[PDB]
């Protein structure tokens, strides 16, 4: 498929926000398709980069990266101070089927809403 | 939160394959926690390892999903190949609650968008 304006719903702590992000080109050097949110300032906008490579085995990489604006004293242009990252990689092999890959994808997707990862990430209290 | 039997529903293309998994110990050397299902085999079971860190907080989630095969002239089965999955979160010390929750939920929801399911299921670029 080709890039399109992707609108993610059901996002946030309270689960009411939603964000619309649109494509912003593909880097020819390494095929890292990029998506961004229209935040009116290029350096203060959320970013997503997705890229699948070619072989012995395949590799799918997703990098989410978003900053937090901070109003510096004595200046009007805000500067990026805190920077949250997120990395995801999948490493299926050649002879793998497709139902197995879908199983991995859906399992990881549902694991991120389980009452385990909620405490793992929101409060950072380790599983014990 | 102490480890508890995690159950997941509506997994896969059909949205019907349910999966139940329970904790299977905590490694003390590196402070990781493990989860698996009971497949009556030492190896051929899906497993998930989760671990947070203590300082640039780092949260890591790894998934191993192996397959089985009937080896030629072997009583026992053998693992042929396994799908991996790795997830990394790298917040900083002054991170707030809302921002981290935003990152988590965005990564979760984006994983079911048509773009990314098409990227994973058919393995094609954009």
């Amino acid at each position, epitope marked *: 498929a080709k890039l399109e304006t992707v*609108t993610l719903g059901f996002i946030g702590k309270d689960g009411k926000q939603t964000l619309v992000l649109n494509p912003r080109g593909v880097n020819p050097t390494n095929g890292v398709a990029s998506l961004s949110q229209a935040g009116a300032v290029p350096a203060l906008e959320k970013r997503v980069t997705v890229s699948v490579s070619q072989p012995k085995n395949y590799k799918v990489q997703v990098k989410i990266q978003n900053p937090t604006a901070c109003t510096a004293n004595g200046s009007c242009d805000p500067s990026v101070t805190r920077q949250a990252y997120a990395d995801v990689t999948f490493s299926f092999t050649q002879y793998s089927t497709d139902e197995e890959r879908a199983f991995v994808r859906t399992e990881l997707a549902a694991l991120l809403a389980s009452p385990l990862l909620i405490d793992a990430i929101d409060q950072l209290n380790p599983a014990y | 939160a102490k480890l508890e039997t995690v159950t997941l529903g509506f997994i896969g293309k059909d949205g019907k394959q349910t999966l139940v998994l329970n904790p299977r110990g905590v490694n003390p050397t590196n402070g990781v926690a493990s989860l698996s299902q009971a497949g009556a085999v030492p190896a051929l079971e899906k497993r998930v390892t989760v671990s947070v860190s203590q300082p640039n907080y780092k949260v890591q989630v790894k998934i191993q999903n192996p397959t089985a095969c009937t080896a030629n002239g072997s009583c026992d089965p053998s693992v042929t190949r396994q799908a991996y999955a790795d997830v990394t979160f790298s917040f900083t010390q002054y991170s707030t609650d809302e921002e981290r929750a935003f990152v988590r939920t965005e990564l979760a929801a984006l994983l079911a968008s048509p773009l990314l399911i098409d990227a994973i299921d058919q393995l094609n670029p954009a």
Partner: antibody
Amino acid sequence: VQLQQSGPELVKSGTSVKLSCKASGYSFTDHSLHWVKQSHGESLEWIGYFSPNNGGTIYNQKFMGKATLTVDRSSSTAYMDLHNLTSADSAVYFCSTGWDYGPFDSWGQGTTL
Amino acid sequence: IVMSQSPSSLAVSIGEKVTLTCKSSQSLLFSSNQKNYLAWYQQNPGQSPKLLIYWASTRESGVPDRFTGSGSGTDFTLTISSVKAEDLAIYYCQQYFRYPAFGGGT
């Protein structure tokens, strides 16, 4: 979060009326402030909203001529004007807040005309 | 986007499985992932309304589990676990993406 709406007025003729919403408990950094009009009975229509990330000057149709929106960030309050009023000023106008594209969660008490 | 609602008022008596039906003029799967964009509001005749159900199937904190909604592409239901002493008054259905719009009554 909590917002407050100030005062009912009963002026006649369609010259100009000032309706002000005293917003509190948040900032206009991300949230959007809507101006749903309840009219009378059923069929309460949406007027407009002020989003710094969406433009803040979006108006529902058949209302552009008789509606203007301005918001000041110093006092963290919003207030709108009605250019002409003959019978569309039937009843209460409501003030509500929410996320960018999210639903309308918390509404202040209304003032009728 | 124009919205249509169930007949004006039901004949709710007591303890029955009354379901309010809202049918849309256009599919509300704007979101890339399969999440609808409807909300349900209750409006007592005296004071300001309140939000009940959003994303057409998810409750919000402060509402009993008695309420439930079932989502589809363009036709939706609000099923209530029977009626109790104070759950009366006008119930509103809203799509709230891009251009919002209300419609209908009880």
